[PDB]
Design a protein around this ligand. Structure first.
Ligand SMILES: CNC(=O)c1cccc(Cn2ccc3cc(-c4conc4C)ccc3c2=O)c1
Length: 379
């Protein structure tokens, strides 16, 4: 009875309602309705279930203002909740696409992190809900935009890069202390709030660690420009690695902010993969770079193999690095100091810091396509 009230429980009221609602969806087809048992359930429950569908949070309760992000299986929408008039970013994930592409389980960690991290470094989730087509995650809007947009609009000086690198480190350290490795650290995932401070956002590739702090994985995951050698090398077989893969992707981020291009750019994915493999040779700063010895040192200390990578022993050895010497902020208070770019926002749906941007087949027998999504609804 404690778990029925526990928002972390798999058998709370919201998951029970998901169970009943998924069942009705997956049975209500005339073919399956020839079974009398199936029809005896559906006629008894159809009316109340459609009443429940209207009363629970649904997509029509939101006004879609503009699309501000896209991803493999859906989009992010800037929405206004009609009743409350509050403003949110709503992420949609396609159930058809996720089933078709056998990718229907990455979203639990994403949901739980944003729902429960309760951290200034993690975008908070207020509501998760679903309909027969989509999963929805209603998050706090990040009007600052992402670091892609920022780098597109400024020549980033080393004083700014110091700041964003420090905040990314504290954000990644925060996610580490929850037992997770991010595995897909990129400027597209680094968003800025009303005040210009960083939060992490796309936790689709995240994974919980061992008691050893390790993870077993055989799939290379993340983004090609930012993937570390150990994760890339794990596509073969029996990859065993720890959180220090996120520090590799901080180094790629530092290079990109200061140099203007990713360190292992290539005109093919296949080329990028090969450069990362050959990183001890392909990593090469342009001659006209004009980047400090301290910045080059930190970048190079991140863009190494895990055995000699800065951060392997913890974050303290990152924090004391001389590149982070500065007269603006400390590691203790950085988020309470002034950001390099404070966003000038004209409305609560000002979206000026974001660039502009098939159904299930009717079953013949019970397939259960709605079953992988039971328990996703939250609050
Ligand atoms: C398997 N993963 C996918 O298919 C997938 C589907 C949709 C989007 C993404 C990646 N992406 C992109 C932009 C984005 C913006 C915000 C945001 C927070 O606050 N304000 C804003 C704006 C929050 C999350 C995301 C985000 O996740 C991935």
């Amino acid at each position: 009875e404690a778990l029925i009230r526990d928002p972390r429980s798999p058998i709370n009221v919201e998951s029970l309602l998901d169970g009943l609602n998924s069942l009705v969806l997956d049975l209500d087809f005339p073919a399956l309705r020839k079974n009398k048992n199936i029809d005896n359930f559906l006629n008894r429950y159809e009316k109340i279930v459609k009443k429940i569908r209207g009363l629970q949070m649904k997509a029509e309760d939101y006004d879609v203002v503009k699309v501000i992000g896209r991803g493999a299986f859906g989009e992010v929408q800037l929405v206004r909740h009609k009743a409350s008039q509050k403003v949110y970013a709503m992420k949609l994930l396609s159930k058809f696409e996720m089933i078709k592409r056998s990718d229907s389980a990455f979203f639990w960690e994403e949901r739980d992190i944003m729902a429960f991290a309760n951290s200034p470094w993690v975008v908070q989730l207020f509501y998760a809900f679903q309909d027969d087509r989509y999963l929805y995650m209603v998050m706090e809007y990040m009007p600052g935009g992402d670091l892609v947009n920022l780098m597109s609009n400024y020549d980033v000086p080393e004083k700014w890069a110091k700041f964003y690198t420090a905040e990314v480190v504290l954000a990644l350290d925060a996610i580490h202390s929850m037992g997770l490795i991010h595995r897909d650290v990129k400027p597209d995932n680094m968003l800025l709030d009303k005040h210009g401070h960083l939060k992490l956002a796309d936790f689709g590739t995240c994974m919980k660690m061992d008691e050893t702090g390790m993870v077993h994985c055989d799939t290379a995951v993340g983004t090609p420009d930012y993937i570390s050698p150990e994760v890339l090398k794990s596509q073969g077989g029996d990859g065993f690695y720890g959180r220090e893969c996120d520090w590799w992707s901080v180094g790629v981020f530092l290079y990109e902010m200061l140099v203007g291009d990713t360190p292992f750019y290539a005109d093919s994915l296949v080329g990028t993969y090969s450069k990362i493999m050959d990183h001890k040779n392909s990593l090469c700063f342009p001659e006209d770079a004009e980047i400090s010895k301290h910045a080059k040192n930190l970048i190079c200390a991140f863009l190494t193999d895990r055995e000699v990578r800065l951060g392997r022993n913890g974050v303290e050895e990152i924090r004391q690095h001389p590149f982070f010497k500065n007269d603006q902020w400390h590691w203790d208070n950085i988020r309470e100091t002034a950001a390099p770019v404070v966003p000038e926002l004209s409305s609560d749906i000002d979206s000026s810091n974001f660039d502009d941007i098939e159904t299930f087949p009717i079953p013949k027998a019970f397939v259960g396509n709605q079953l992988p999504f039971i328990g996703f609804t939250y609050y």
